Amino acid sequence: RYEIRWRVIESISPDGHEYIYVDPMQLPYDSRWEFPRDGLVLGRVLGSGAFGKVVEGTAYGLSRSQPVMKVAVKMLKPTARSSEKQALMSELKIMTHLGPHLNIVNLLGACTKSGPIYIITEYCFYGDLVNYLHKNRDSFLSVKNLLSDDNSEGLTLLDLLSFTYQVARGMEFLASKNCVHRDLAARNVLLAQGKIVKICDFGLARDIMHDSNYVSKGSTFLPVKWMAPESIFDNLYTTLSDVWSYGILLWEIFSLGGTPYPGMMVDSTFYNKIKSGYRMAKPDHATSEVYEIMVKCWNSEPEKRPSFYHLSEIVENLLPGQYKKSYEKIHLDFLKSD
């Protein structure tokens, strides 16, 4: 019945107390985005939620670079409320505002006139990261070119470092735009062709009510296992809090899809342990260096945590130099599209 909104920060008071977030309705939609309905063909349903669904699709003429293009389409169910339509429009405005990045699922086009609203997004071949890791759990054994391509081989530490680097980059981009994700987790990361990490959100395509990851508090659902202490207790959300989420996410990556705080249910006892300063032990496939990154992200003092930009730098040093070169070419190819 809900989704967690990405918040973009318009301004912060000199004291550091009053935060003003942009109002999506206030922002302006760009008509250039509009794509003719006839030019879009809808396929199989990628996901289904009580109020919405994601569908496979092909867009014709949408892109000069890819005249026939595989894509994913976001649409509301008839069940969706009048207010919810607003949410889709809001998503369009915010996404246009942020602009495009290689590491986030991107908005390609939208159909908003004389029809059910349709959001066109990049199509990711591998699906969500959690499922992908589980699928490749077995056959995983502890060159750089192979990593940034579709060649299939047993999953490697190198692959994990790549996913680790891409999420940092995607997050760095979001932070630069003063955008706070508030629900960063492997479930919200999808993998595209070429093993390119794309960051997304839980959405209306799947049911938050039916997901164990979220605890419902008040009128909202919270991914407590991924929340920074300030968020849980002080209800404060920032780029720094996201960093905490990034560390939890890394734990998910190095445990091959493992649930954080395994064997621990979220309860009063869990909250107390976090206040105590309790942190997760090293994951099985995590190197000492990677675990160190997770621990830094989990610092009690948010200002103490590393910036996403710093994290990208740290991860890069743990990757062969050719990986960085490959990322750069892919980044440039991505910005050259169309």
Nearest CA among 230, 227, 208, 211 for reference residue 219:
208
The yes or no reply on residue 75 touching Cl ion (CB under 5 A) is no
Q: What is the crossing angle of helices 308-317 and 288-297, to 10°?
A: 170
Other CB atoms within 10 A of residue 291 CB: 18
Q: How far is the CB of 44 from ligand 6T2 (least distance, A)?
A: 8
* Contact partners, residue 96, CB within 8 Å, separation at least 6: 27, 29, 30, 33, 107
Site for ligand 6T2 in 108-137 (CB under 6 A): 121, 123-128
Q: Which of 135, 273, 310, 324: binder of Cl ion (CB under 5 A)? A: 310
The yes or no reply on residue 146 touching ligand 6T2 (CB under 6 A) is no
Catalytic site residue from 159, 183, 201, 242: 183
Distance between CA atoms of 67 and 125, rounded to whole angstroms?
18
Question: Is residue 46 a known part of a binding site?
Answer: yes
Strand partners, 9: 21
Question: Is residue 161 a known part of a binding site?
Answer: no
Q: Which of 54, 129, 208, 249: binder of ligand 6T2 (CB under 6 A)? A: 54
Contact segment (CB under 5 A) with Cl ion among 109-117, 144-152, 171-179, 188-196 equals 171-179
Distance between CA atoms of 311 and 305, rounded to whole angstroms?
10
The yes or no reply on residue 58 touching Cl ion (CB under 5 A) is no
Answer for the pair 111, 117: CB distance below 8 angstroms, yes or no.
Answer: yes
Q: How far is the CB of 108 from ligand 6T2 (least distance, A)?
A: 11
Told to judge if 183 belongs to the known catalytic residues of this protein, a careful annotator would answer: yes
Q: Produce one character per residue of 158-181: b if its CB has 16 or more CB atoms within 10 Å, e if not.
A: bbbbbbbbbbbbbbbbbbebbbbb
Answer for the pair 189, 200: CB distance below 8 angstroms, yes or no.
Answer: yes
The yes or no reply on residue 6 touching Cl ion (CB under 5 A) is yes
Query: Which residue's CB is nearer to ligand 6T2, number 121 or number 148?
Result: 121
The yes or no reply on residue 92 touching ligand 6T2 (CB under 6 A) is no
- Residues acting as catalytic residues: 183
By CB under 6 A, name the binding residues for ligand 6T2: 46-47, 54, 72, 105, 121, 123-128, 190, 200-201, 203, 205-206
Residue ranges for the known binding site for ATP are 46-54, 74
